[PDB]
Design a binder for this molecule. Structure first.
Ligand SMILES: [Zn+2]
Length: 35
């Protein structure tokens, strides 16, 4: 995982999450970042 901390943070809205999956999926739900 990441170095230090207890969670992962959005690069867009700077919100914190319990996991890298909870972060990855947040971006698709509200920032709409597709492929
Ligand atoms: Zn965000």
């Amino acid at each position: 995982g990441s170095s230090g901390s207890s969670g992962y943070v959005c690069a867009l809205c700077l919100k914190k999450f319990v996991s890298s999956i909870r972060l990855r999926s947040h971006i698709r739900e509200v920032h709409g970042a597709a492929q």
